[PDB]
C-alpha cells in the first residue's frame, strides 16, 4: 500500500504509518468476481477523506459503521493525485487516503 | 532501587524473560524522569529576548560586583559568596598566564597550536618561531599569541632537549614538568619588566595554600623525585632560568604547579560544525584567580577554556549568600576513589573531604559495586587500604602533629569489603570480590591496548563479553563497566557493526550511570546526551525498517538533546560555538520529529477551538474530524498553526488576531519567527498586514537572522511554469523575486513611521546591522541575495543603501558571491554604475571565481565590462588560468553551514530524498551508508568531498572540458604572456599545474574504482563501453586544454618571475613606501600637512 | 593486476585502436609492434 | 601513552564519536611542509616587550581598549579601501560593563552613539583618541576618528560613587539594623569645568624621577589645553586592531617601546 | 496522466482500506560487511562463489591453500550482498537471498522460521542480492 | 511597539495550581539546589573505622517482621482500637 | 521450528484501539515502554527459544509422560504394523510425527486470529488462550530428552548454513 | 508537475543559511619526509651520574636570597641563617 501511495504521487518521501482494511478479504473476492461479470477491469482510485462528496473522518466511519457518501455523483481521481489538502502548509506532515 | 532488585533476580535466574524485560522498562522509566532539564531553566534558554543621579549609578554599579571575596582563613584559599548565583553564571572570566599541550612520547603533536590551547583558525596559514623558524616544530596561529608568547618560546626552544632529559631521570608526567619550566621562564622574563617586591610568582608562594608538611610525611616519593628535579635543575641550567630561586622553595614551586594546574579540553570551532568531535586537544593552564579555590569533587563550579581562549568557570549549584565556589582539579571526575587519591595524586586531589572520598560507598553513588554472595542483595564497597590510611593522616584538622607523634612513638596493600545491607566483611568476601575485581580489569586493560593500537573490532568484542558476562556482578554505577558502556555503544554505531538497539542499550545504561555519578552539569553530558538522542533517533528509524507503527515518541530523542544544549550552556558558555551547534542538531531533530513549538513561559492555550473549527479546518483543509481529535493539535503543538498560516497566506480579521498573540516565540524546527516565515515566502498581502499593525522585525535569532537576512536567505523557487543571455527563467522565480522586492520595501516604509514620529532607537540602522556568527561568515543581507540569484531583491538593496562594496568572512565583496551563484543578471546590476577588479583577502577576484565554476558566459560577461585578466594574488600567487587549472578537475566543493547535511541521518528526514537534494551533496548514492569519509579539512568554510559520481561516470568531466576549453580559447587572446609563465604558491605554471591536479584526479579516480560501489558491477557491456569512451576523450580533452595553457607561454623569453627580476632603483623605494602606508597608517596627517 | 579483468579489456582495446587510428595515417603500417604491450593485456584478460 | 590522562575519558568521548586513537597524531615534520608560515624576527621580541607590559600594569596603571574596532584579522586592509565589519570588542565590552555605564553600539560607517544621558552635565565620556604629534585623531576605517572611553568621566562622578553612595548606604543598613574592589583609587577629581570641557587624548610617556617609563594619557581640548594627568594608558592590541599595522611602529607612536 | 473516472453503479465502488503516511525519507540501514570467521577485521573481498566477505589476511588462506579455490574470482567488499538488509520479519539479519517467483527478500532465519520455511524449492527459486541488483540495472 | 495580542488566547503563566506540576517543577530544581555539606572543606575527616560501621549500617532498617506475626498486629490494631474509639464515640 | 514461530509470535507486540490514540500521540511527539520488538531482536534466537521451553506453563512430569495407558505408550504398544517390506516406519517416527502435523494446524490457526487481532479476554502466556495438548506433548518430550551441545551444534549449523541445511534435506 | 517539486522547496528551507564561499583551494601533494627533531630532542642523554639522594648537610651562613628576591640591610648582604639549617637543627 505505501509503494502505491508512492506511485500516485511522484514522492520518494511517503511512507506508511498503518492501516485499516474496511473490507473482509470473502468481500474483495466477491468484487473481484462481479467486475469480471461485468467485463472489466479493477482500478485503485486514492481519494482524500475529505474530497468526497459527503467528508467523513476516520472515527467518522467507523463508529457509523457506513461511509454516506452518493458514489453516483462523485468523481474518482485515478493515477495521479492531487496533493492532500492542507499540504502547502506542513509539507512534512501526516495526512489520510481512502 | 527497582532497577536494583532487577538485577539480583537476574543473577539468581538468567535471561526469564520478564526479568529483561522490565529491566528495561525500568530503565528507559528512570531515563524518562532523570534526562529533563526543569522547565524554567528549559524556557530560559529559548526565552529569545535576550538575543533581542549618583545613586542609579551606585545600584546599577554594585549589582554587577565580582561574587568572591578572598578570604584567608588558617592557611587555605577558602573563596565565600556575597550574591545568590543562579546557575549558568558567569564568575572570574580571566588570561590563561601560560599553557602546554599534552606532550607526549614518540614525537607527536596535537595538530593545534602548541601554546594557545585552541584550533588554528586558518590550517594552511600559521606564524613562526623566532629562534629556529621552519626546524623548530610548533607553529604559532594568530597575532594575539605571537605577542602573548613569543619570549617564552625564545627561552624554551634552545632547551627543549635539556628538559627532556630532566623528565626520564626523575620519572614524571612531562607535562608537568614542562608546564612548571615555562612557568619559570614567563615569570622570569616579568621580573625584568616589574619592580622586585610585586610579582604575580611573588604572590603564588606565600599567599597560596601549598601544601608542603603534609607531602614529606605523607605520600614521601612524590616528594624525593621532586627533590631528584629539582637538583637537576639547579646544576646544568642558568641561575636566571629558575629565577634564582632557592632548593627548598623549588619544591614549593613544584607543588604549586601540580596541584593547582587542570587539564582543560579545548574545543574546535570547525569539528562542532562539522558533527565530529569537539575537545581536539588536551592540556595544563594555569591562572591566578583560578588557582584562588578550594578543591572538592563535589562541584559548585566547572572550569573551561573557551574559543576566544579565556579560562573561565560559571554555576553549577545555586549558591546562595554565604557560599563556596569549588572546582574539580581532577579531570574524570568519574575515576574511582582509590585512583583520585593515587600515589602520584597532586596533594590537593590527595586530601580531600568530599562525602565521595569519605563514606566508602562514594557517598550513596556506589562506583565499586561487587555483587555480594552472602546475602545475595546489595553490594558491598571497598575501604581505603590500612598501607594508605597511615600515609594520609597529614592533610586533615591538625594533621600534621598527629603524623609526627606517631611517626617517633612507633596486608597493607590488602583493602577490605563491606557489604551495605547485611554488613558482613569476611576475608571470603574480600577474596571473592577482589577476584571479580581484577578478571574485569585484566579485561578492560586488554581492550585498551586492543583501541589504542587501532583494532578496533577486538576492542568492542571483549568490552561487550565484559557487559555480557560480569553484568549483574556489577553494579549500574561501575568505572569499568560504564567505560565499558560508552565505548561498546560508540563501536556500535560508527565501525564495522551497528547492530543497532543493542547500542541502544549501552548509551542508555550509561546516561544513566553518569547522571548518578557525575555532578548535575559537566562537559562529557554534552556529548553522551547527545549520542543517545543520536542512537535513539536511528532506533527509531531501525523500528521503521520492521513493522511501521510509531517509533519511540518525541520526548525519547528531544529531551536528551535539550540537556545536552544546557550543559552546553553551563560549561562551555551560552554563546560559545559548542553550544551553537548542539543547537542546531536540536532544531534539525525538532523538524523531524515534527514538534515546532519553543518551549517557553508563555504556552498560549485556546480552551475554545470546538466552535472556531469553521478557521481551524480551514487552515490544514481538513474538514472531516471532531472536537478532541484537533484539539490534540492545540495543546502539543500551538504554534504550527502559526507556521502554516505565516506559509499559506490569509489575511483575514482572524488571521491576524491568531497570529498577533505568538510574537516573541520564534519557531523549533527552523527558528524564523512568525513574520519571519511569513515574509520567506513571498506573501506580500500577509506582510503588509503584520508591519503596519506592529510587529516586531528587527531581532534576530542565535545565530543572528534577522527576517531580512532570512528573507534573502531563502533559495529563489525554481521548476515552476514557462519561462522568462538568453536568460529565462520560471514565473514562480519572477513573482518571487519582486514580491519580496516590495516586501523590503515595505520594510523601509515600516522603519519611516517608527523613526519619523520621534528621535532615536533608530530603526533604519538596525535594519541595516543584521549579520551572522562566523559560522556562516558574517553574511548580510545582500550577501545572501547575491549567492541566491535574486536579481531584483538586490537591485533594491542596492537603491535603497545597503553598501555594494561592504565584506564579510574571508573578505568577500558581493560581486564575489553573485558570480558563485551563476545568475548573469545579479552580475549586471552589481556593476550597472564599481569593482570589476577587487581582492579578498585570499587575493581572489570574480574572475577567478568564474574560471573555478567554469561557465562560459560568466567570464566572457566580466572580460566585456573590463575585468583585468593579468591579476595576481598577494597571498597565493592565484592567476585566472591558475583558477580555471584545479577547477577543471575539483573534488572539494568548500561551503558555509550551521551543520552537516552530510552526516546527519535527521537532516535526510527532514530535507528529502529528491533531485534538488542530490545536487546539493546532501544524501549520497555511494558504496557506504553515512560512515566516515576523509575528513578532508577542518576548516569553518567547511570543506566537503563531492558525491562519488565524479570519479566514477564520466559525464560530468566530459562536460566540464568542454567549456574549460572554449573559456582558454577566450581568454587566450585577451591574457598577456607572462601569466602562462607566473609561478603559484606551489611552483607551478598555469599548464603543469592542470597536469598534475589531472594525475591526482586520476589517482584518485583507481582509489575509488577499486573501494568500488555495486552500481559498477551491475553495468552491462555497453554502458562498461559507454564509460570508457568517455575518460579517453575525457583524457583528450585534459591534454587539448594542457596544451593551449602552455603553447601560449612558448613564446616569451623570459622565464624568470617578476619577483626576482634585477629591479630599477624606483621600484626599491617604493616597495619600501608602501610597506610602511600599511605600517604606520597613521604618518599621513602629519605628513601633507606638516 | 587486483582482481577486474573487465576494464582491463577496454582500456587495452581503447589503447589498441587509438594508437592504430594515428599508426594508420601517421605512417602506411597498422601493425607496429609497438601495441604489443596491451596486446598481451588482450589475450590474458580475453582468455581469463 | 602511559599516564592518567590517557586510556581513559580523553578516549571514551572519542570512541564514542567513532574515531580512531590513531588520528589525533602526528610526528613533527608534516606540521611545518603543510602549513606554510612566513619569518618572524627580532622585532617580534621586541614588540612583545610592550605586551606583558599591559599585562604586568594591571592592578595600578589599567589599560585602555578601543570600541572602533573591526572583525577582520589585521594587516589586510590599507584603511581607505576596504570596508570590514565593524563591531564592539570583547574586552572593551567587558571593560565598560565593568565600569559600570551602558554597552554602546557601533554603526557600519565606524560612529558610536551615546546610549546615556547622564554624560552631558560633565562633558564627553567617548572621546577621539589623537595624536600626540600632530594633533588629529586617528583616521580609523573610513576616515572617521578611532575613538575610546574617557577616564575623566570615570573617575570624576562614577569611581567615588561606587564606594561612597552604594556601598556605604548598603553596610550601615543591613549591619547595624538587623574590600576595596575597585581599581586604581587616586588622585581626586580636579573640577567640574574640567569635566565639562575634553574631546581628546594623547600617548604619552611622562613620569620621570623614580618610575623611568610609565606612560600615561594627556587631555586636550580645541586649542590644546593640557587639562587631565590620568593614567589609564591605552591598549596595544585593541590599537594594533584598528590600524592593521602589523609591526613595531605602534610602540613607536604610542611611546610604549622601552 | 491524469484520469477522472465517474461510475454509474454504487454496487461498483467497494472501499477498500484507510491509509495514513507522513512524508519523510526512510532509508535503510545499509552494513558494509565484516570477516566471517574472526570479527576482528573489516572485510575487503568477498567471493560469491563461497558466498563469504573476508579481509586480506583471511582471502589468502581459506583460497590460497587448494588449487580449485585459487580459480575463485573475488569482488570488493562492497559488492556484498549482505550490504541490504534488515528482514523487518526477523530483524538483525541481513538480507542475502532475494525470491524471484515471489519478489520478496529473505534472510537465513527467514527462511527457516519465517515465510519461505515449509515444504519449497524447486518451484521458489532464490539467489543472492548482488546478482538481483545486477538485472534491475540491466534491464 | 507590541502586536496588539488577540483577547482568543487564554495565557496562564504556568505557576504553581495542577498537583502534578507543581511537583515536577520542584523535583528537578531540587537537584540543581545547593548542597549541604558534601564538599572537601581543606581538612579530610575519615568516618570509615570498620567496626562501629557494622552498627552504622544497620542503623536505619524497617522491622524484620514476618507475615504470620504481621496477620495478628493487624488484628490487635484494627479491632481493639475500634472497639475503643467507638466506646469513646 | 514449531517453537521458533511460538517465540516470535509471543514476541510482537499487540494492544487494543490504542493504535490510533498512539497515531495521535506520534504528531505530539501506556507510556512507559512502546519500543519493545527491536530491542530484544538483538540476540541469537537458540538462547530465547530454549529458554522459551524453559518457562512453559503446563507441561507434563516424567512420571506421567510415560503413562502406561497414555497415546505415548499406545503407539509403542498396541498397532504399528513391524518393520517388514521396505524403508523405515517406526513406531514414535509416526507419532511425533503426526503431533507435529496436528501442532501446526492449532499453530496456523492461531496465527490467523492474530492477523484479525482478536484481543484476548480481559508468565510465558502462550498466544491466545490455547488448549493445546498436541504442543504439550511435544513441549515435555523436547524438555526432558534432549542436550543443548548437539542442539546448539546442528542449529548454529542451521541458521547460518540455510543453504546446507535445506539442501541435505532432501539429499 | 507537483507533489514532487513542492516537497523540493521544503527541503530548500533548511538549506537557506548555507552559502557558497569564495575559497579556490588547489590542492597539492606534499610531502612528509625530513628531520624530525622532537625524535632528536627526546633522544638525549645526560652525562654526569648523579648519585642516590642521602640527608643533607645544610649550609648555615649564607646571604638571603630567600623567594628570588635580594634583601638588603641597608644596601648590602646581611648574612643570616638558611631555612633549611632551621629545619636540620
Known amino acids: 500500500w505505501e509503494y502505491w501511495i508512492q506511485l500516485s504521487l511522484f514522492t520518494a518521501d511517503l511512507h506508511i504509518v498503518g492501516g485499516w482494511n474496511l473490507a473482509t478479504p470473502a468481500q474483495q473476492q466477491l468484487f473481484d468476481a462481479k467486475a469480471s461479470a461485468l467485463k472489466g477491469p479493477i482500478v485503485y482510485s486514492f481519494l482524500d477523506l475529505n474530497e468526497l462528496e459527503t467528508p467523513q473522518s476516520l472515527e467518522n466511519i467507523i463508529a457509523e459503521k457506513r461511509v454516506k457518501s452518493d458514489w453516483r455523483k462523485q468523481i474518482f481521481p485515478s493515477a495521479e493525485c492531487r496533493p492532500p489538502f492542507g499540504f502547502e502548509g506542513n509539507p512534512s506532515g501526516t495526512f489520510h487516503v481512502m | 532501587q527497582a532497577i536494583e532488585f532487577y538485577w539480583t533476580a537476574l543473577f539468581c535466574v538468567p535471561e526469564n524473560r520478564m526479568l529483561i524485560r522490565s529491566l528495561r522498562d525500568a530503565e528507559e522509566r528512570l531515563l524518562a524522569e532523570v534526562s529533563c532539564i526543569p522547565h524554567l531553566y528549559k524556557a530560559a534558554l529559548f526565552d529569545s529576548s535576550r538575543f533581542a543621579l549618583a545613586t542609579e549609578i551606585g545600584r546599577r554599579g554594585a549589582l554587577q560586583r565580582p561574587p568572591f571575596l578572598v578570604v584567608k582563613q588558617d592557611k587555605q584559599t577558602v573563596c565565600i559568596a556575597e550574591v545568590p548565583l543562579e546557575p549558568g553564571q558567569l564568575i572570574f572570566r580571566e588570561l590563561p598566564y601560560v599553557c602546554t599541550p599534552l606532550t607526549l612520547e614518540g614525537g607527536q603533536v596535537f595538530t593545534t597550536c602548541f601554546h594557545c590551547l585552541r584550533e588554528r583558525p586558518v590550517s594552511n596559514r600559521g606564524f613562526s618561531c623566532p629562534v629556529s623558524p621552519h626546524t623548530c616544530p610548533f607553529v604559532f596561529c594568530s597575532w594575539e599569541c605571537l605577542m602573548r608568547n613569543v619570549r617564552v618560546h625564545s627561552r624554551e626552544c634552545g632547551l627543549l632537549p635539556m628538559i627532556m632529559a630532566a623528565a626520564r631521570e626523575a620519572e614524571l608526567s612531562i607535562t608537568g614538568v614542562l608546564h612548571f619550566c615555562r612557568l619559570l621562564l614567563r615569570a622570569g622574563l616579568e621580573r625584568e619588566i616589574v619592580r622586585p617586591e610585586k610579582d604575580m610568582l611573588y604572590n603564588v608562594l606565600g599567599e597560596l595554600q601549598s601544601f608542603e608538611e603534609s607531602v614529606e610525611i605523607g605520600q614521601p616519593e612524590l616528594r624525593r623525585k621532586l627533590t631528584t628535579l629539582a637538583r637537576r635543575l639547579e646544576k646544568d641550567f642558568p641561575p636566571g632560568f629558575y629565577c634564582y630561586l632557592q632548593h627548598r622553595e623549588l619544591i614549593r614551586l613544584m607543588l604549586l604547579v601540580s596541584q593547582y594546574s587542570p587539564f582543560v579540553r579545548s574545543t574546535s570551532p570547525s569539528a562542532a560544525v562539522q558533527r565530529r568531535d569537539p575537545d581536539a586537544s588536551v592540556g595544563l593552564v594555569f591562572s591566578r584567580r583560578l588557582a584562588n579555590l578550594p578543591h572538592s569533587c563535589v562541584p559548585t563550579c566547572t572550569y573551561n577554556l573557551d574559543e576566544d581562549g579565556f579560562v573561565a568557570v560559571r554555576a553549577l549549584c545555586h549558591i546562595p549568600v554565604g557560599g563556596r565556589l569549588c572546582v574539580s582539579m581532577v579531570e574524570d571526575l568519574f575515576t574511582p576513589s582509590a585512583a583520585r587519591k593515587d600515589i602520584e595524586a597532586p596533594p590537593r586531589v590527595f586530601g580531600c573531604g568530599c562525602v565521595r572520598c569519605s563514606d566508602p560507598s562514594e557517598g550513596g553513588r556506589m562506583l565499586r559495586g561487587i555483587r555480594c554472595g552472602v546475602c545475595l542483595r546489595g553490594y558491598c564497597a571497598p575501604f581505603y587500604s590500612p598501607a594508605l590510611q597511615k600515609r594520609l593522616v597529614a592533610y586533615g584538622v591538625g594533621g600534621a602533629e598527629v603524623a609526627r607523634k606517631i611517626a617517633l612513638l612507633a596486608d597493607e596493600a590488602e583493602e577490605r569489603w563491606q557489604c551495605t545491607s547485611c554488613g558482613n566483611a569476611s576475608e571470603l568476601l574480600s577474596v571473592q570480590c577482589d577476584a571479580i575485581e581484577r578478571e574485569v580489569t585484566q579485561l578492560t586493560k586488554k581492550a585498551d591496548r586492543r583501541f589504542v593500537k587501532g583494532k578496533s573490532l577486538p576492542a568492542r568484542k571483549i568490552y561487550v563479553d565484559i557487559i555480557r558476562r560480569f553484568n549483574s556482578r556489577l553494579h549500574p554505577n561501575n568505572f569499568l563497566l560504564y567505560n565499558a558502556h560508552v565505548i561498546a555503544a560508540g563501536l556500535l554505531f560508527r565501525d564495522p557493526g551497528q547492530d543497532v538497539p543493542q547500542a541502544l542499550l549501552y548509551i542508555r545504561r550509561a546516561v544513566i550511570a553518569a547522571e548518578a555519578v557525575l555532578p548535575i552539569c559537566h562537559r562529557e553530558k554534552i556529548h553522551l546526551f547527545t549520542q543517545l538522542a543520536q542512537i535513539s533517533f536511528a532506533a527509531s528509524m531501525a523500528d521503521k525498517l520492521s513493522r511501521r507503527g510509531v517509533g519511540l515518541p518525541g520526548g525519547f530523542v528531544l529531551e536528551p538533546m535539550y540537556s545536552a544544549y544546557w550543559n552546553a550552556a553551563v560549561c562551555c558558555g551560552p554563546r560559545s560555538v559548542l553550544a551553537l551547534t548542539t543547537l542546531q542538531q536540536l532544531r534539525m531533530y525538532a523538524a523531524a520529529l515534527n514538534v515546532a513549538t519553543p518551549p517557553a513561559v508563555v504556552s498560549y492555550k485556546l480552551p475554545t477551538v470546538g466552535v472556531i473549527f469553521s478557521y481551524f479546518r480551514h487552515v490544514l483543509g481538513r474538514h472531516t474530524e471532531s472536537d478532541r481529535t484537533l484539539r490534540r493539535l492545540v495543546e502539543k503543538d500551538p504554534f504550527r498553526l502559526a507556521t502554516t498560516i505565516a506559509r499559506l497566506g490569509l489575511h483575514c480579521l482572524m488571521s491576524l488576531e491568531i497570529l498577533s498573540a505568538f510574537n516573541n516565540v520564534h519557531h523549533l524546527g527552523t527558528g524564523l519567527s512568525v513574520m519571519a516565515i511569513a515574509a520567506s515566502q513571498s506573501r506580500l498581502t500577509l506582510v503588509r498586514k503584520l508591519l503596519d499593525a506592529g510587529f516586531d522585525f528587527l531581532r534576530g535569532n542565535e545565530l543572528g537572522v534577522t527576517p531580512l537576512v532570512a528573507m534573502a536567505a531563502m533559495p529563489l523557487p525554481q521548476g515552476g511554469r514557462s519561462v522568462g543571455e538568453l536568460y529565462f527563467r520560471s514565473e514562480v522565480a519572477d513573482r518571487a523575486d519582486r514580491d519580496q522586492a516590495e516586501i523590503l520595501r515595505l520594510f523601509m516604509q515600516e522603519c519611516s513611521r517608527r523613526d519619523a514620529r520621534a528621535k532615536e532607537a533608530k530603526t533604519k540602522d538596525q535594519l541595516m546591522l543584521a549579520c551572522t556568527h562566523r559560522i556562516l561568515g558574517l553574511n548580510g543581507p545582500l550577501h545572501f541575495a547575491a549567492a541566491r540569484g535574486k536579481t531584483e531583491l538586490c537591485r533594491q538593496l542596492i537603491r535603497s543603501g545597503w553598501n555594494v562594496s561592504k565584506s564579510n568572512g574571508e573578505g568577500a565583496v558581493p560581486l564575489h558571491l553573485a558570480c558563485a551563484s551563476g545568475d548573469v543578471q545579479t552580475v549586471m546590476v552589481f556593476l550597472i554604475p564599481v569593482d570589476i577588479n577587487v581582492k579578498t583577502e585570499r587575493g581572489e577576484t570574480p574572475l577567478m571565481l568564474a574560471a573555478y565554476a567554469v561557465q562560459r558566459d560568466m567570464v566572457k560577461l566580466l572580460l566585456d565590462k573590463g575585468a583585468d585578466a593579468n591579476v595576481v594574488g598577494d597571498r597565493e600567487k592565484m592567476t585566472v588560468l591558475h583558477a580555471l587549472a584545479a577547477g577543471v578537475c575539483r573534488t572539494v566543493e568548500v561551503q558555509y553551514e550551521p551543520l552537516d547535511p552530510r552526516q546527519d541521518l535527521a537532516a535526510h528526514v527532514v530535507m528529502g530524498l529528491n533531485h534538488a537534494s542530490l545536487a546539493a551533496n546532501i544524501y549520497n548514492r555511494g558504496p557506504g551508508y553515512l560512515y566516515v569519509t576523509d575528513t578532508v579539512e577542518d576548516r569553518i568554510p567547511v570543506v566537503s568531498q563531492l558525491a562519488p559520481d565524479l570519479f566514477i561516470f564520466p559525464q560530468e568531466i566530459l562536460r566540464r572540458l568542454t567549456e574549460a576549453n572554449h573559456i582558454g580559447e577566450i581568454l587566450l587572446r585577451h591574457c598577456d604572456h607572462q601569466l602562462f609563465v607566473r609561478k603559484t604558491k606551489k611552483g607551478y605554471t598555469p599548464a603543469e599545474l592542470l597536469s598534475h591536479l589531472w594525475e591526482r584526479f586520476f589517482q584518485t579516480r583507481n582509489e575509488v574504482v577499486e573501494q568500488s560501489e555495486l552500481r559498477l558491477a551491475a553495468l552491462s557491456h555497453q554502458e562498461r563501453q559507454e564509460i570508457e569512451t568517455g575518460w579517453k576523450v575525457a583524457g583528450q580533452l585534459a591534454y587539448r586544454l594542457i596544451e593551449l595553457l602552455r603553447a601560449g607561454g612558448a613564446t616569451v623569453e623570459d622565464a624568470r618571475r617578476p619577483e626576482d627580476m634585477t629591479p630599477r632603483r624606483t621600484d626599491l623605494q617604493e616597495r619600501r613606501l608602501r610597506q610602511l602606508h600599511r605600517d604606520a597608517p597613521w604618518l599621513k596627517a602629519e605628513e601633507m600637512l606638516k | ?48 | 601513552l602511559r599516564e592518567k590522562s590517557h586510556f581513559h575519558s580523553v578516549a571514551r568521548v572519542r570512541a564514542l564519536y567513532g574515531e580512531e586513537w590513531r588520528s589525533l597524531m602526528v610526528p613533527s615534520a608534516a606540521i611545518l611542509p603543510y602549513v606554510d608560515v612566513e619569518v618572524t624576527g627580532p622585532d617580534t621580541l621586541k614588540l612583545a616587550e610592550c605586551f606583558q607590559f599591559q599585562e604586568a600594569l594591571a592592578v595600578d596603571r589599567p589599560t585602555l581598549p578601543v570600541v572602533n574596532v573591526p572583525q577582520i584579522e589585521r594587516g589586510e586592509a590599507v584603511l581607505e579601501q576596504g570596508h570590514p565589519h565593524m563591531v564592539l570588542s570583547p574586552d572593551a565590552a567587558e571593560l565598560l560593563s565593568q565600569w559600570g555605564v551602558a554597552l554602546p553600539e557601533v554603526d557600519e560607517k565606524g560612529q558610536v552613539i551615546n546610549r546615556e544621558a547622564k554624560l552631558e552635565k560633565h562633558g564627553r565620556l567617548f572621546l577621539p583618541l589623537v595624536d600626540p604629534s600632530t594633533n588629529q585623531p586617528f583616521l580609523g576605517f573610513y576616515g572617521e576618528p578611532v575613538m575610546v572611553p574617557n577616564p575623566a568621566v570615570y573617575h570624576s562622578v562614577i569611581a567615588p560613587a561606587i564606594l561612597a553612595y552604594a556601598r556605604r548606604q548598603a553596610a550601615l543598613v543591613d549591619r547595624a539594623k538587623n574590600c576595596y574592589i575597585p581599581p586604581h583609587m587616586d588622585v581626586p577629581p580636579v573640577a567640574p569645568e574640567v569635566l565639562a570641557k575634553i574631546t581628546k587624548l594623547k600617548p604619552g610617556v611622562e613620569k620621570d624621577p623614580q618610575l623611568g617609563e610609565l606612560p600615561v594619557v594627556i587631555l586636550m581640548d580645541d586649542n590644546n589645553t593640557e587639562l587631565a594627568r590620568l593614567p589609564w594608558q591605552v591598549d596595544i592590541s585593541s590599537f594594533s586592531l584598528a590600524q592593521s599595522s602589523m609591526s613595531i611602529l605602534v610602540a613607536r607612536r604610542l611611546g610604549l617601546l622601552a | 496522466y491524469r484520469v477522472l473516472y465517474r461510475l454509474k453503479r454504487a454496487d461498483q465502488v467497494l472501499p477498500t482500506a484507510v491509509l495514513e503516511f507522513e512524508m519523510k525519507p526512510l532509508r535503510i540501514q545499509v552494513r558494509q560487511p565484516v570477516c566471517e570467521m574472526c570479527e576482528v577485521l573489516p572485510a575487503t573481498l568477498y567471493c560469491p562463489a563461497d558466498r563469504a566477505q573476508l579481509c586480506d589476511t583471511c582471502d589468502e588462506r581459506v583460497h590460497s591453500a587448494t588449487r580449485m579455490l585459487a580459480r575463485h574470482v573475488r569482488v570488493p567488499a562492497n559488492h556484498s550482498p549482505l550490504q541490504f538488509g534488515s528482514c523487518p520479519y526477523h530483524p538483525s539479519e541481513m538480507i542475502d537471498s532475494v525470491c524471484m517467483t515471489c519478489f520478496v527478500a529473505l534472510c537465513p532465519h527467514c527462511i527457516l522460521i519465517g515465510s519461505h520455511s515449509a515444504a519449497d524449492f524447486s518451484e521458489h527459486p532464490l539467489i543472492s542480492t548482488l546478482d538481483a541488483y545486477k538485472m534491475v540495472m540491466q534491464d | 511597539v507590541a502586536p496588539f495580542a488577540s483577547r482568543i488566547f487564554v495565557p496562564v503563566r504556568l505557576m504553581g495550581k495542577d498537583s502534578k506540576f507543581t511537583k515536577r517543577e520542584e523535583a528537578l530544581q531540587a537537584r540543581y539546589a545547593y548542597p549541604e555539606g558534601q564538599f572537601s572543606p581543606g581538612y579530610y575527616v575519615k568516618a570509615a573505622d570498620i567496626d562501629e560501621k557494622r552498627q552504622a549500617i544497620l542503623q536505619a532498617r524497617p522491622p524484620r517482621m514476618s507475615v504470620f506475626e504481621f496477620q495478628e498486629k493487624m488484628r490487635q490494631l484494627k479491632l481493639a482500637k475500634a472497639r475503643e474509639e467507638t466506646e469513646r464515640a | 521450528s514449531l517453537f521458533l514461530t511460538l517465540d516470535v509470535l509471543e514476541r510482537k507486540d499487540y494492544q487494543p484501539m490504542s493504535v490510533t490514540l498512539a497515531r495521535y500521540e506520534q504528531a505530539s511527539a501506556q507510556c512507559y515502554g512502546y519500543l519493545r520488538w527491536l530491542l530484544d531482536s538483538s540476540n541469537s534466537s537458540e538462547m530465547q527459544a530454549l529458554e522459551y521451553l524453559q518457562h512453559y506453563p503446563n507441561k507434563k512430569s516424567p512420571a506421567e509422560i510415560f503413562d502406561p495407558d497414555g497415546d505415548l505408550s499406545f503407539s509403542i504398544c498396541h498397532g504399528t504394523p513391524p518393520t517388514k517390506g521396505s524403508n523405515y516406519c517406526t513406531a514414535l517416527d509416526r507419532f511425533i510425527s503426526s503431533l507435529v502435523s496436528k501442532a501446526q494446524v492449532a499453530i496456523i490457526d492461531v496465527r490467523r486470529r492474530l492477523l484479525r487481532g482478536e484481543k484476548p479476554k480481559l508468565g510465558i502466556r502462550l498466544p491466545l488462550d490455547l488448549r493445546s495438548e498436541a504442543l504439550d506433548m511435544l513441549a515435555s518430550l523436547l524438555y526432558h530428552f534432549m542436550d543443548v551441545r548437539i542442539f546448539r551444534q546442528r542449529w548454529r549449523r542451521r541458521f547460518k548454513d540455510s543453504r546446507g541445511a535445506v539442501h541435505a534435506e532432501d539429499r
Open chain 3, 1 to 48: 593486476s587486483q582482481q577486474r579483468y573487465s576494464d582491463a579489456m577496454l582500456q587495452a582495446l581503447h589503447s589498441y585502436l587509438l594508437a592504430k587510428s594515428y599508426y594508420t595515417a601517421y605512417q602506411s603500417a597498422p601493425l607496429e609492434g609497438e601495441m604489443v604491450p596491451e596486446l598481451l593485456l588482450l589475450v590474458k584478460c580475453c582468455g581469463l
